[PDB]
Amino acid sequence: SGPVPSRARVYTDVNTHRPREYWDYESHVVEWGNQDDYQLVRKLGRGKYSEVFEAINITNNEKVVVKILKPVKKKKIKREIKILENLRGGPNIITLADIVKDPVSRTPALVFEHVNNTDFKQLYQTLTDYDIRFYMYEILKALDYCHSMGIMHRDVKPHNVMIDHEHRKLRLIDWGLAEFYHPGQEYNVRVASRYFKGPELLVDYQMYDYSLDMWSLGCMLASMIFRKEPFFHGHDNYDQLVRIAKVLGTEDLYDYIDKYNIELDPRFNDILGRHSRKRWERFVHSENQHLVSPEALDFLDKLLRYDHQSRLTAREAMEHPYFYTVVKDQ
Ligand SMILES: O=C(CCCCCCCNc1nc2cc(C(=O)O)ccc2c2cnccc12)NO
Numbered sequence: 001s002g003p004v005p006s007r008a009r010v011y012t013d014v015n016t017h018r019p020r021e022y023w024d025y026e027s028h029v030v031e032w033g034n035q036d037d038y039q040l041v042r043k044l045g046r047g048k049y050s051e052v053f054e055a056i057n058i059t060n061n062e063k064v065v066v067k068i069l070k071p072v073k074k075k076k077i078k079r080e081i082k083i084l085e086n087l088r089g090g091p092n093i094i095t096l097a098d099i100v101k102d103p104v105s106r107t108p109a110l111v112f113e114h115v116n117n118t119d120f121k122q123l124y125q126t127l128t129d130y131d132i133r134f135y136m137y138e139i140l141k142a143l144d145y146c147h148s149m150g151i152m153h154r155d156v157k158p159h160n161v162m163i164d165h166e167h168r169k170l171r172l173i174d175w176g177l178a179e180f181y182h183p184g185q186e187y188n189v190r191v192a193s194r195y196f197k198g199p200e201l202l203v204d205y206q207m208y209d210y211s212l213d214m215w216s217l218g219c220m221l222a223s224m225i226f227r228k229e230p231f232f233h234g235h236d237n238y239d240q241l242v243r244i245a246k247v248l249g250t251e252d253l254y255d256y257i258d259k260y261n262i263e264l265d266p267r268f269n270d271i272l273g274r275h276s277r278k279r280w281e282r283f284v285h286s287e288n289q290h291l292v293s294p295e296a297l298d299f300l301d302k303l304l305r306y307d308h309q310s311r312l313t314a315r316e317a318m319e320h321p322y323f324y325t326v327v328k329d330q
Pocket residue numbers: 044045052065067094112113114115116117118119120123158159160161162163173174175
């Protein structure tokens with residue numbers, strides 16, 4: 001026997017109902033724009049497999065951002081392009097304005113809308129309770145939208161949320177790890193950064209779905225309301241699950257593993273041992289108490305569940321009382 005199958009609880013068949021050109025990114029033909037329209041102004045970042053510049057569109061003198069794509073797996077170029085084009089115009093999704101060939105190496109470069117960003121290591125220190133709720137709701141809007149469009153982001157983390165706090169404007173960026181959800185498909189578990197990897201990634205359960213993004217979101221929320229960054233501070237991939245188990249407890253972990261017939265490494269199983277669940281109240285202290293409320297902890301608790309089928313969907317999350325007043329704000 002093998003692992004038990006799983007299906008997305010919501011939006012399960014969205015891609016099946018669309019024409020195949022929507023999700024068959026390998027068959028996408030790229031419409032290339034005019035590289036001469038853009039001139040690089042300065043370097044903004046040099047992440048993995050990509051370089052990011054501030055640039056100028058000289059046909060309208062619009063400040064834009066150019067990301068030069070250099071993945072090892074070339075199939076991710078069309079993938080990112082197709083996903084950006086399918087989600088274009090959606091709430092809080094970064095806008096792909098153009099695609100051009102870098103005149104140096106003929107490598108693809110994406111042109112994006114420019115956002116007036118403020119770094120999170122400078123921002124999450126000054127956020128009020130209300131601000132945390134408001135921006136979580138904006139992220140949820142983006143996630144419900146991309147999930148409803150058949151797409152899982154798979155790399156939700158602070159650096160991939162651009163915030164113009166002066167205008168209370170938020171954009172979800174870097175769709176280079178995003179994939180289309182197809183029921184029954186097995187996905188790669190190497191996605192996401194360690195601190196934000198869901199337990200399904202950490203136990204090598206490959207038939208995961210949109211709910212992966214809901215675990216990541218939970219990890220961000222916990223780090224903001226408790227002012228512990230990252231909240232689960234694993235030092236390698238096994239330690240990440242150990243740190244999770246020390247908070248959520250091993251009883252629900254072992255029930256999760258049994259439910260889906262997941263094959264755990266025996267020495268790892270021995271290492272996890274037995275840990276009781278810690279009540280969320282243990283993480284409150286005088287320095288973070290102004291960010292904690294009963295509805296915050298209930299919401300957090302309903303995002304950070306081992307069983308991916310048990311986590312709140314983005315829409316259920318948007319209906320949680322934690323956002324009640326925020327919902328009346330717009
Ligand atoms: O949490 C945070 C963390 C701040 C991290 C700073 C990263 C600097 C890179 N800077 C931009 N990287 C982009 C990447 C993409 C993409 O890969 O899709 C799309 C758009 C941008 C972008 C747009 N406008 C201004 C700057 C950038 N801040 O709130």
